[PDB]
Amino acid sequence: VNIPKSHPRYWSLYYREKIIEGMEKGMTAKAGLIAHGRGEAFDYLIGERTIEPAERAMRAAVAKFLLAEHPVISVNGNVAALVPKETIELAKALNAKLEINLFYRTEERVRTIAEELRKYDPEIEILGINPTKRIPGLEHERGKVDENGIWKADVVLVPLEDGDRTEALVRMGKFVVTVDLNPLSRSARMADITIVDNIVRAYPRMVELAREMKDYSREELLKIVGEYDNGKTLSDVLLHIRDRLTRLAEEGIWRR
Amino acid sequence: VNIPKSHPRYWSLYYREKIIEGMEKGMTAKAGLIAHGRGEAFDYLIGERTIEPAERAMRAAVAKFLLAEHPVISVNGNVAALVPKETIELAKALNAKLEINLFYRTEERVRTIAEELRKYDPEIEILGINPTKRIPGLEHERGKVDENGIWKADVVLVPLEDGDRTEALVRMGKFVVTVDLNPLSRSARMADITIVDNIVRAYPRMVELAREMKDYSREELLKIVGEYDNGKTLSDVLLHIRDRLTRLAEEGIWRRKEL
Numbered sequence A: 001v002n003i004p005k006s007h008p009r010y011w012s013l014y015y016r017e018k019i020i021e022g023m024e025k026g027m028t029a030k031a032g033l034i035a036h037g038r039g040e041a042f043d044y045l046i047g048e049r050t051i052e053p054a055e056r057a058m059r060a061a062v063a064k065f066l067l068a069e070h071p072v073i074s075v076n077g078n079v080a081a082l083v084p085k086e087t088i089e090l091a092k093a094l095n096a097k098l099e100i101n102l103f104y105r106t107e108e109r110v111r112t113i114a115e116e117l118r119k120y121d122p123e124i125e126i127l128g129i130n131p132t133k134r135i136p137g138l139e140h141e142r143g144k145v146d147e148n149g150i151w152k153a154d155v156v157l158v159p160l161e162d163g164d165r166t167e168a169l170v171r172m173g174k175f176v177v178t179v180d181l182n183p184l185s186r187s188a189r190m191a192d193i194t195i196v197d198n199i200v201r202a203y204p205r206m207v208e209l210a211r212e213m214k215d216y217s218r219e220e221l222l223k224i225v226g227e228y229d230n231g232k233t234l235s236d237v238l239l240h241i242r243d244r245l246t247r248l249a250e251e252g253i254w255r256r
Numbered sequence B: 001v002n003i004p005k006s007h008p009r010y011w012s013l014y015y016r017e018k019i020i021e022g023m024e025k026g027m028t029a030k031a032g033l034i035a036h037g038r039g040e041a042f043d044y045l046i047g048e049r050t051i052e053p054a055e056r057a058m059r060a061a062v063a064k065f066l067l068a069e070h071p072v073i074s075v076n077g078n079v080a081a082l083v084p085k086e087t088i089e090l091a092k093a094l095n096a097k098l099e100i101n102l103f104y105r106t107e108e109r110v111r112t113i114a115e116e117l118r119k120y121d122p123e124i125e126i127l128g129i130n131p132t133k134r135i136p137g138l139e140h141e142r143g144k145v146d147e148n149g150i151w152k153a154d155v156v157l158v159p160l161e162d163g164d165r166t167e168a169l170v171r172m173g174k175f176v177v178t179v180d181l182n183p184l185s186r187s188a189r190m191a192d193i194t195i196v197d198n199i200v201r202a203y204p205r206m207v208e209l210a211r212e213m214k215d216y217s218r219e220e221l222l223k224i225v226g227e228y229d230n231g232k233t234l235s236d237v238l239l240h241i242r243d244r245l246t247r248l249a250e251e252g253i254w255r256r257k258e259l
């Protein structure tokens, strides 16, 4: 990361280095590198900041998790490369189990990811190591879940997830929250709560909200998670990007 | 193995596979995978189809290439993984030479890219194997081109290209045509003709266009080229995206299977 701190693409470049090493540590899938670029472009368009529609979604999600009877947080190759410590934090803050859930499971991937998480907590409870259950509707390898993790969860957080799984989880009766910079992806459109923000900002922001809501009443929380409309939240994100586009055009370098 | 053709995201997933196989073959760099994703995001915004402003730029690019005296088509790692066959097809249909130009050049990636191309034509000549001419304004390892290729070219096609490189060629007096799904990238803004469409739809369509216009009159060809506005095209692309976002926001997208 040898670039002036004043570089406008400072952080973006920094995480791009992180995602590359992720694959270098053998935990980030190649498809994960591609998904990362999808994120980069939408983040650039959005403004690399947590927009209002996102703060809104995170509020409802934290409220929703606080009421969960068995909340679970899913971790994949990208999460492990970008926010390995922050995901352990969010999981402690919401008293939620941690499950390694990969679309493409392998003995190495799981081990490496569990190892990466154990670098910030060698004691934390990590599920999905030995997955016995299956998410209905998915190909055997892609629908693996842990008898004690997602399989029994009522509210689940699946960040940077493939649309088929999000949909399948909703179909099996799980309430699904996702973090996804692409508001037009199947997953973003299928989730009950869609947080359109970079996970590097969303995760510490939610750990914050969980503190700011730690002493909330089950009534206050029910009011929150009760007034949330994911549809209007998605439409606003789209409108935001549209307005962001109008201005990005009247700026930068032009040639004529 | 492959994606079930019935899967609605078939094409999207097919090409993700191809770019992945490309890196597996040593032609594509890891960062090429990330760049593929950036393209996909913009494709999500345009709606994953060829829009009229793109078709418009495509006809202009073909017209210009057919009128060119020393046309050259550049090939990089992402190009090699996604449209190796169509790249060769386009070059022949435009009677242009092919040159390998990479961001991270190594003897292995060049070879592997060369081999891939030859699998569709063991006969085609490939420039850029060991380029010796340096284009000023670029870092040492990023600006060497082939003396008999881009160095002497008048019209150059540089798809999925770095802005600095697109910008450098323009500065060397080359008429630059690019294919880039991001209408706001430096490359899209600096190129003379910007084709905002996915290269997997663009190259096949241009091949078809080169054959169709292979017999046009210089009068027609010069008219097409003469009356083409790249700025207007980029703005028309942006307007299409902005109206599409407007429409979708109004209709709503939550829980919709398709858009």
Ligand SMILES: Nc1ncnc2c1ncn2[C@@H]1O[C@H](CO)[C@@H](O)[C@H]1O
Residues within 6 Å of the ligand: A035, A036, A037, A038, A039, A040, A042, A082, A160, A161, A162, A179, A180, A181, A182, A185, A197, A198, A199, A200
């Ligand atoms: N750093 C990130 N933060 C949040 N979402 C991301 C990030 N990188 C990639 N994604 C999302 O992952 C999705 C694909 O699984 C993409 O739609 C993209 O928006």
Ligand SMILES: Nc1ncnc2c1ncn2[C@@H]1O[C@H](CO)[C@@H](O)[C@H]1O
Residues within 6 Å of the ligand: B035, B036, B037, B038, B039, B040, B042, B159, B160, B161, B162, B179, B180, B181, B182, B185, B197, B198, B199, B200
């Ligand atoms: N398949 C593709 N077709 C056209 N342009 C692409 C594709 N993939 C990536 N790009 C573009 O190439 C640039 C990165 O080299 C990005 O700005 C992106 O818009």
